[PDB]
């Protein structure tokens, strides 16, 4: 028996930490919703 | 129970003690968040019942008491923001400039962000704080590190 509680507001914030890197993927997604990498 | 916008916590008591399966958001009066967080079962919010509404495997999404009112679109530039979720931790902004997946339907912004399985369903916001889309359906990379599709509905 799932619930919900309330964590926080949805908001932009300035000086929120900048991290990650943008990698470009060829990727597939199958009829179960999975993605998988093309290569 | 709580219907006031913003960013919650799914919770299951199925497990040991109770467990942070996922995350979502309640936007003019639906809960949006992944299927693989709920499996398309029905959620309590106090003494309240919240019943899936709309849900697709393949989108791996889910909305509760009404249709998806999500649609805000990343603009393909500009840096966004993962508002992470993590099982026992405080919500928190992440900045992060997005990748792209590129599918023979289309290319996808990505997001180059490690937080465990029960953060899926966080969501992405662009500058005016709008949601994107939700953080926790990707892939693993030649490398160990995870890479989520920005996955964003249909408002009908
Ligand atoms: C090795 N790492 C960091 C991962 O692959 C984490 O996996 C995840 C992360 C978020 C949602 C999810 F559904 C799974």
């Known amino acids: ?7 926080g507001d949805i908001t932009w914030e300035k000086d929120a930490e900048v991290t990650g890197n943008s990698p470009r993927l ?12 093309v290569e | 129970g709580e219907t006031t916008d913003g960013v919650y916590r799914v919770m299951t008591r199925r497990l040991l003690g109770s467990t942070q399966v996922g995350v979502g958001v309640m936007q003019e009066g639906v809960f949006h968040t992944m ?61 992060t400039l997005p990748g792209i997946f590129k599918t023979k339907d289309g290319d ?34 030649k490398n160990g590190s995870y890479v989520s599709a920005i996955t964003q509905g249909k408002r009908e």
């Not at chain 1, 028996?1 to 964590?7: K, L, N, P, Q």
């Not at chain 1, 060829?26 to 990498?37: I, K, P, R, T, W």
């Open chain 2, 35 to 95: 299927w693989h967080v709920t499996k398309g079962a029905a959620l309590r919010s106090g003494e309240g019942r919240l019943d899936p509404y709309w849900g697709d495997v393949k989108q791996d999404l889910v909305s509760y008491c009404g249709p998806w009112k999500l649609d805000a679109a990343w603009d393909g530039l500009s840096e966004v923001q993962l508002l992470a979720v993590p099982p026992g931790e405080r919500a928190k902004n992440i900045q």
């Open chain 1, 26 to 37: 060829d990727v597939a997604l199958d009829e179960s919703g999975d993605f998988s990498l």
């Open chain 2, 108 to 141: 996808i912004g990505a997001v180059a962000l490690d937080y465990p399985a029960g953060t899926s369903g966080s969501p992405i916001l662009d500058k005016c704080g709008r949601v994107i889309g939700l953080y926790g359906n990707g892939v693993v990379i």
């Open chain 1, 1 to 7: 028996d799932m619930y919900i509680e309330r964590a």
